[PDB]
Amino acid sequence: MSPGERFLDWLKRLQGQKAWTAARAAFRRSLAFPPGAYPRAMPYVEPFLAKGDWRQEEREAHYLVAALYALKDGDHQVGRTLARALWEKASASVEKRFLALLEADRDQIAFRLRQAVALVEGGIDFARLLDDLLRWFSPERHVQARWAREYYGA
Amino acid sequence: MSPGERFLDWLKRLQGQKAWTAARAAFRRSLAFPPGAYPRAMPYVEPFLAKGDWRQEEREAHYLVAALYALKDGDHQVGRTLARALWEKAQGSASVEKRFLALLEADRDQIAFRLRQAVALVEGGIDFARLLDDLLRWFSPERHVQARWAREYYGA
Secondary structure, three states: OHHHHHHHHHHHHHOOOOHHHHHHHHHHHHHOOOOOOOHHHHHHHHHHHHHHHHHOOHHHHHHHHHHHHHHHOOOOOOOOHHHHHHHOOOOOOOHHHHHHHHHHOOOOOOHHHHHHHHOOOOOOOOOHHHHHHOOOOOOOOOOHHHHHHHHHHH | OOOHHHHHHHHHHOOOOOHHHHHHHHHHHHHHOOOOOEEEHHHHHHHOOOOOOHHHHHHHHHHHHHHHHHHOOEEEEOOOOHHHHHHHHHHHOHHHHHHHHHHHHHOOOOOOHHHHHHHHHOOOOOOOOHHHHHHOOOOOOOHHHHHHHHHHOEEE
C-alpha cells in the first residue's frame, strides 16, 4: 500500500465529513502560500502526518496535494496521471508547460504544478501524484522520465 | 533495420528540417546533464521512443547518441566506427590509446563522460548507427562490444 494511496484515502474520508467545507476553503486558500506554511490547513493534514517520519519536502508534497485535490474539488480519476491529462488537453503551447514542469526546481514546482492542475479537464490520479512528488527530486530524474513516457505515450 | 539504424534515420530527417537548429542546440546543451534528465531535448526524442519498449538504460543510450551526433553536426560515416577513428587519431597522439582504454573500462557512471570526450577527439565522421547499437549492448555480461572494439582498434 502506497503512501500516495493512503493519503488519498485520508483525503477522501475527509471530504464526506462536515468539516469538508472549512477544510476545502482552507486548502484552496493555502495555494497563496508555500505548502505547510498555512496554519488553517494544518488540522486537516498534521494528524495524518504524525503517523510517519517525514522529511520536510515530503510534508510539503502532502500539503500541496491536498490543496490541488481541493482545487479539483476531490475530483480524483484513478489511472489518469496529470501528464496524460496534460497531453489530452491538445496543443503545442501545452507542450511547453509540460516541459517547464519537468525543469522546475523547489522554488517553482508548487506554482507550476498548481497552474498545470487547474488547466487540465477532468480529474487526475492524486494517489499517483503524491507518490510521484515524493520522489521528484532524485538526481536520476526517474519520475520526470515516466511523465515524459506518459505524456508522449498518449 | 537495427535500432541504431532506425534512430540514425530519425536524426537525419530531423536534420533536414527547420527544427534542426533548435534541436542541435538542445542536444548540445544536454551534455551538461545526465542522459534523459534534460527536458528541452525531450520533444525531439520521446516521440521516437514511444513507438518501442525500452529499458531506462536503453532510453539513455539514445539520448547520448543524439547529443553526440549533434556535437558533430551529424557527421556520420557508415563503417567508420568510433574505435577505428580513435585508432586513426592515435597515430598523431599516444595520448589517445590511453583514452580509448579508459573508455573501454567505463562503467555506468563514467561512460557518458568518456564517450563524449572520445567522440570530440576524433576527426571525420563515425558510424552513429553502429554506435547506438553498441551502446545498447555495452553492459552485456560477456562484454561482446568492448571485445569487438578492441579488435577494431588493435586489428588495424
